[PDB]
């Protein structure tokens, strides 16, 4: 016999994948998904995904297993920085913006968004951070915007040589190559069998 409790609604997976606008990488949005049924079939009929790679679970088996505290976070990067969203990877995003733990149990989903997140003359609403004092620990959001001191001269007075603004914008233009077009990334993270389950999916 199989017993699962009483749950009403169907999880906001359409709400996080189909939205009007996403958030920048330096300020990635985070949504808590709980007390619903997680049918992972609305994911497949969405887009021809550029990358659907799952760590710790196999992509067909997520219906007939379940878990707790599933987390959904989203941001927008370019073409060549998709490979940086992985455990044990280094780079500008991976060390300064968004760091994944080495032992990661989840899935990474990315697809092209050149038609939406790009405009003629450049779309300057998607930023990413270049400079910090040190690296970034996993699952930390760094929103603070203060001037980074690159030279020996202490630049207290703001906006001078060798004291730089910490945020640079992505320049998205529709006629770019595939390596520099925007890509919407959604990363799912959950924990497998060490806590009581709160989301499971198909009841029987």
């Amino acid at each position, epitope marked *: 016999i199989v017993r699962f409790p009483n749950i009403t609604n169907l999880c906001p997976f359409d709400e996080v994948f189909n939205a009007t606008r996403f958030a920048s990488v330096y300020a990635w949005n985070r949504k808590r998904i709980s007390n619903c049924v997680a049918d992972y079939s609305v994911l497949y009929n969405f887009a021809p995904f550029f990358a659907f790679k799952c760590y710790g679970v196999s992509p067909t088996k997520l219906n007939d297993l379940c878990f707790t505290n599933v987390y959904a976070d989203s941001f927008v990067i370019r073409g060549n920085e998709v490979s940086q969203i992985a455990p044990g990877q280094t780079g500008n995003i991976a060390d300064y913006n968004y760091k994944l733990p080495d032992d990661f149990t989840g899935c990474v989903i990315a697809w092209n968004s050149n038609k939406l997140d790009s405009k003629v*003359g*450049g779309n*300057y609403n998607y930023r990413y951070r*270049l400079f910090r004092k040190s690296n970034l620990k996993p699952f930390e959001r760094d929103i603070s915007t203060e001037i980074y001191q*690159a030279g020996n001269k202490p630049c207290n007075g*703001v*906006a*001078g*040589v*060798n004291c*730089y*603004f910490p945020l*640079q*914008s*992505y*320049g998205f*233009r529709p*006629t*770019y*190559g*595939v*390596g*520099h077009q925007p890509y919407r990334v959604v990363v799912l993270s959950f924990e497998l069998l060490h806590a009581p389950a709160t989301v499971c999916g198909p009841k029987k």
Partner: nanobody, 129 residues
Framework: QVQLQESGGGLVQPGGSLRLSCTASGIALHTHATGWFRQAPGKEREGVSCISSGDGTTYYEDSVEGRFTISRDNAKNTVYLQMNSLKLEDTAVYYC??????????????????????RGQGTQVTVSS
């Protein structure tokens, strides 16, 4: 508050040479891509050169190949245009501009379409007398 400031120009005799300098206050180079454009009296503006963000692939126009060079020094945060063998129709005003990303010739794009986000005041060169 990001200003791009230029130094150079003057009265140069044909066969001469200058070194134009563009300095960035707020932003940093080797992350942006800076380029030089020029305006002649009664004419429209045209590109001169481009350098990309990392390392730097140098792109030159059909009028100034083999004569001009572009070079970026990230210690003083300066970009430099060495102009050599100046002929008489090079009398123009020169602007330096910066744009985020490896902007010039990515895909089916090229920097002659002037849409750079940062601009400058400009310096006048005069090749005559």
């Amino acid at each position: 508050q990001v200003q791009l400031q230029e130094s150079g120009g003057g009265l140069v005799q044909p066969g001469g040479s200058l070194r134009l300098s563009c300095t960035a206050s707020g932003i940093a180079l080797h992350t942006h891509a800076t380029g030089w454009f020029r305006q002649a009296p009664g004419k429209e503006r045209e590109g001169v050169s481009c350098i990309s963000s990392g390392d730097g692939t140098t792109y030159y126009e059909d009028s100034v190949e083999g004569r001009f060079t572009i070079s970026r020094d990230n210690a003083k945060n300066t970009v430099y245009l060495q102009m050599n063998s100046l002929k008489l129709e090079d009398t123009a005003v020169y602007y330096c501009a910066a744009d985020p990303g490896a902007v010039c010739h990515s895909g089916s794009y090229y920097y002659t379409d002037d849409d750079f986000y940062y601009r400058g005041q400009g310096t006048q060169v005069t090749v005559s007398s």
